[PDB]
Write an enzyme that holds these catalytic residues in place. Structure first.
Site, PDB file in Angstrom:
ATOM      1  N   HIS A  63       0.712  -1.358   0.148  1.00 44.86           N
ATOM      2  CA  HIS A  63       0.139  -0.249   0.024  1.00 44.86           C
ATOM      3  C   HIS A  63       0.751   1.106   0.051  1.00 44.86           C
ATOM      4  O   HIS A  63       0.237   2.299   0.084  1.00 44.86           O
ATOM      5  CB  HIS A  63      -0.879  -0.066   1.254  1.00 44.86           C
ATOM      6  CG  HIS A  63      -2.076   0.798   1.008  1.00 44.86           C
ATOM      7  ND1 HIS A  63      -2.783   1.364   2.069  1.00 44.86           N
ATOM      8  CD2 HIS A  63      -2.833   1.585   0.044  1.00 44.86           C
ATOM      9  CE1 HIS A  63      -3.855   1.951   1.726  1.00 44.86           C
ATOM     10  NE2 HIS A  63      -3.810   2.180   0.505  1.00 44.86           N
ATOM     11  N   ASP A 108      -2.410   1.481  -4.989  1.00 40.89           N
ATOM     12  CA  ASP A 108      -3.714   1.688  -4.009  1.00 40.89           C
ATOM     13  C   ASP A 108      -4.807   0.847  -4.436  1.00 40.89           C
ATOM     14  O   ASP A 108      -4.604  -0.141  -5.365  1.00 40.89           O
ATOM     15  CB  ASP A 108      -4.255   3.298  -4.438  1.00 40.89           C
ATOM     16  CG  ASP A 108      -3.156   4.194  -4.231  1.00 40.89           C
ATOM     17  OD1 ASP A 108      -2.149   3.981  -3.393  1.00 40.89           O
ATOM     18  OD2 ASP A 108      -3.187   5.284  -4.826  1.00 40.89           O
TER      19      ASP A 108
END
Lengths: 233, 120, 233, 233, 144, 120, 144, 120, 144
Positions: A206, A210
């Site tokens: 992350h 995304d």
């Protein structure tokens, strides 16, 4: 009553690495289901018009589709360095081979500009050398994406995998299964058809990726797999 | 969307004869309606396709492969005629107008020389 | 507007432990689906030939099958100590009991060499003493594998669990559900049948276990469950 | 051959936060399947009796049901501070909006005592201001629960999400799909019906919540969703 | 003391578990009787807390054991070469050879018919025989 | 894989009589073929099993339990005869050869004393 | 050297891949021939290790490329303006215009009938033509 | 659970006439039983509901919504009569006793003026 | 000012929500009217920003509340013992007793028939009545 065995020298080299990956890369998962009937039909069509030159498998198709999807969405074909982001333009894929001595990580290069035959030949030559224990170090050092398959065992429906240190994504493939789907019969009703499906899981970091990017990546992979002819362009 | 109609005469004497005769030998009496529907069922089995038919993805994929190298030239349908006699008429767009005709003549043939066929 | 309540003394003892487990044990999951129609039929057959001596449940069957699978694949029945690996030869299983005061961890010993009746009697005696709050410390100290079940609530399809500190695996069981399957009718066609299934999740540490070992473990468990008569040998 | 791009100032502000959440909050997941046919019928009934005043969506229904379930089980509507637990009495929900500049976190207040129209109007006003980049800081600072939806993409069946630092739960919603279910036909047989379902995943912290509490939370949410009329009381 | 045991169901169970294998093992009636002997002994202890059976080789820990382990021991120890004796190998505790007898069956039509059952004859004691016998006719109870 | 054949004569006079008579009283005329297939359907209902039949897992499990303590001695089939008269012949392996015979005689009986039965 | 190629299947493949798009691209026969030329050019190298085609603009790296990239290059370079030449635009390596010919089909009834095939005429060399031809009649081999 | 019975006479002459006549013109002979079952099938199609009927969740939902504004006043059933003639009797609880009667009279009407109807 | 309200649908909704419970609660017409009064007041504010209803006990915050909370308050406060008055308990804002009236229904055959509707009679003001009335005949709007 019990027994104790000294820890191997090679077992700490992987233990430390695994322990570093979890504390260095936050993880988030995404799952999807793919229909592979058409792919099986195409493989059967292309494995009978040959005289013995080659023999194909699902993994090669998935590797090529993974290359195309990487090309369409390049944000996953990246890496996180000390203070700068690294973005590539060539797709190298890491395949996992299991041996009694441990787990290796052969590599395939130039997948984007390649065909199924070369990919299969490379994956099999490297698998043989990995099993025979004469693998050079440069041959398993770095890639962009990693793949794992466990379709040889029918008892594995879905599973998770850990991301390698310098990479930012990994894909895990399960075993096929059968499910009911609705078909609009020409008489003007709804009937039951039996489709064969696989469940694919993808683990992403992350910091470089995304949720939307991973969702789009899964969409491109699915579109390429369900429609197999699109493997040409 | 232009539309067009097709028409064809009809004679129902033979159906009357079969109904009367059946009523005299067993007791069964049934209306003309079931004859009409049963003829309509046997008709919508083998009807040609419009010349401007566009295939779907599955069809093209299967051809390109080699499973159905022999293509199809027939396809079922769901028509419903309009009442009348001395006539049977149907209203359909231009593209299928021709297909709708194969239906009228097929029923026009079965109902005139094979009434007995529509009995059990 | 809000309220504040002081943190309990017992709440930190578990908070610290949970926080230590995640940073000490990398986790990877595996999932599978089991058909349990035959097991239900066997339980019904064995719960009617009795006069009141006992009454069985699914958890006992799963515990025994878990013992057999552990025996076939012993690498999961192990532990990670300071500088050496510990390998056992006896299977001890940890069951989870929920009470308003918190979550306990009763233990069952000698499962491999035991029958269903003794397992049920032990699990119920210990559950009663856990609920009544007169549990000795030695009785909840250490095991090899831990199990959790949530089949009493139909709204839980699948869930995850955290591994205990000294152990290297944990199993989580969901609630049953119904799915369509294909049946080859004797007339020479395919029809729809309604099977009942459960989804089982297993969490493993990657320092003591690998993916293939966990997959084999799941396979042995599945084989033992779907065919229930094999619980004898 | 490769390229390098300097890391953005805003990219580290989220990287550090994500890296802090994983090492500060142990995670455990729970999954469930919800049938939403009746909800769609109700939405269609209520989106045609209007003249242009409003237009509803599934997310508003889920938000309201999430508020009711929070009210029934208040242990999830809490927070973990330095040395004391914080328990609230008002439900504030955090919705995620994706923009090319990044991911925002608009907030909705007073959901318990509110209707669908106000929730939709607020969510859309805030989404517009988030897209136009004139959002005040106070408007995205703190809540109790967070929600994420990815139903716009049909290729996302299920996925996971990371919990925010001060919060103790997060919910992730997938895309709809179709499955076969058994129906007891009045003739005295069993037939096949085609239901539409979604798969909902919930991630919980294990210092403020336990497994049973999360299971009960999922049960209340499911009961409120499958029976939609119960949204009134 | 003498008794008669019907072993039709037990044979069917043996055939079920000897077909789901790939060559790993193969069971026989003697193995089942050994396990049942422990259970019958367990309920009536007058006939220690550990059960040892002599076939004169020895087998240990039958109570906490399965058919697989018991079978392997009985065959390994034979090659190297309470008490049980079997003479079922010649059709002409002591165990005899099987035979067939007629028994009455309550036909659903409401009369009595003939069916062919398979029997063997086996030679505080009464309770021991009863518990052993219960395990044989009803074979599923070998689990608990 | 050794194979063997079984044969049996036939007389089709009664079927001819029924067809002619039906044609004279109502009008229905149908071919011998439907008589052949309909006889084949009523035949493949109750046929014994080979003596060397091996059961499956579900069957043994259900017996070991006690749900189907009464076993079965019948099982359906899917046979297709070979044309001919003054004969009906079938070719099958040795194991089922005997079962295939029960089929020939069953049809040989129905088609000779119960032609009327194969009417509606 | 001259040969005849049947291109009915290739047209069907083009129609399949030109309908699953939303306006992104549109393919033609020339693109397929360029890719096939690299294949047969590699199988028989006597006719370097990189394949460059001149349409006199240039296209590079056909071997490691797809139809999408090749099509875009051929059209961009045209606007700004081994060798291939095409004259299929006028119905009246060198490529001609398509035509229709009768061929025999083995009907399942056991006789011979007439079917209408579409053909084009294209003008060590024999092996090159054979490999190229194999790729055209069987189009799926364009992947490997 | 109180229970009650309902009864109704019957005359089977017309069915006998149809059977005899059919036997003389074609050859078909069938038992009274099929007439009884076929009458029972056509009967259990349109029978009123008990006055103390309680609906289910799905029914009330759609009502509240607006998909089936028009409610139902009919529901199928599965009855089996008891043999006898010069009578047909049925035993049922009090709540449905009235519904069971609509069944007796419906069969009592069909079997007396429409025997022919139960032929093909 | 006077008006007539049809409450057949509202009764069906009450019966639906009073059968999916296990004994937790039980609703009545008065609770529905209280909630609708807030909405009708909300649209036309001339009749403050908080709505308080007197049944003379008091109920607060009807706007941000549900049927469950409102019902419990109305019954607790009764035991301890804008304005609303109800007299529906005797069949012989002010609310009367229900009754039945004939209304026309457009039968699908193309004529007019008789159907039996249930009605109650309730005694800037016109707009208030209209908004209240809209909520009663169409009950689903109680959510927003």
């Amino acid at each position: 009553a019990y027994t104790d065995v000294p820890i191997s020298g090679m077992r700490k080299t992987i233990a430390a690495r695994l322990k570093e990956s979890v504390t260095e890369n936050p993880h988030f998962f995404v799952s999807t289901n793919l229909s592979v009937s058409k792919l099986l039909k195409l493989r059967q069509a292309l494995n009978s018009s040959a005289d013995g030159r080659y023999k194909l498998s699902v993994n090669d198709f998935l590797i090529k589709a993974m290359g195309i999807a990487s090309k369409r969405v390049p944000t996953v074909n990246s890496s996180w360095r000390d203070g700068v982001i690294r973005q590539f333009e060539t797709v190298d894929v890491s395949v996992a081979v299991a041996t009694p001595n441990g787990l290796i990580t052969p590599i395939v290069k130039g997948v984007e500009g390649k065909g199924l035959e070369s990919i299969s030949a490379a994956v099999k030559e490297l698998a043989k050398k990995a099993r025979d224990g004469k693998l050079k170090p440069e041959e398993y050092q770095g890639g962009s994406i990693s793949i794992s398959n466990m379709g040889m065992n029918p008892a594995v429906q879905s599973f998770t995998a850990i991301i390698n240190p310098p990479q930012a994504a990994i894909l895990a493939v399960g075993a096929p299964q059968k499910v009911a789907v609705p078909v609009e019969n020409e008489d003007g009703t709804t009937g039951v058809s039996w489709d064969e499906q696989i469940i694919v899981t993808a683990s992403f970091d992350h910091k470089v990726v995304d949720g939307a990017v991973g969702a789009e990546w899964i969409r491109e992979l699915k579109k390429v797999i369900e429609n197999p002819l699109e493997l040409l362009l | 969307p232009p539309v067009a109609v097709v028409t064809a005469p009809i004679s129902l004497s033979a159906a009357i004869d079969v109904q009367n005769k059946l009523h005299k030998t067993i007791g069964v009496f049934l209306p003309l309606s079931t004859f009409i529907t049963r003829a309509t069922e046997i008709a919508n089995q083998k009807l040609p396709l419009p010349a401007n038919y566009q295939p779907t993805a599955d069809e093209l994929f299967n051809q390109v492969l080699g499973l159905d190298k022999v293509t199809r030239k027939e396809s079922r349908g769901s028509y419903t005629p309009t009442f009348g006699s001395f006539v049977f008429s149907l209203q359909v767009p231009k593209s299928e107008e021709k297909r709708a005709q194969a239906f009228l003549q097929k029923m026009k043939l079965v109902l005139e020389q094979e009434p007995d066929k529509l009995v059990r």
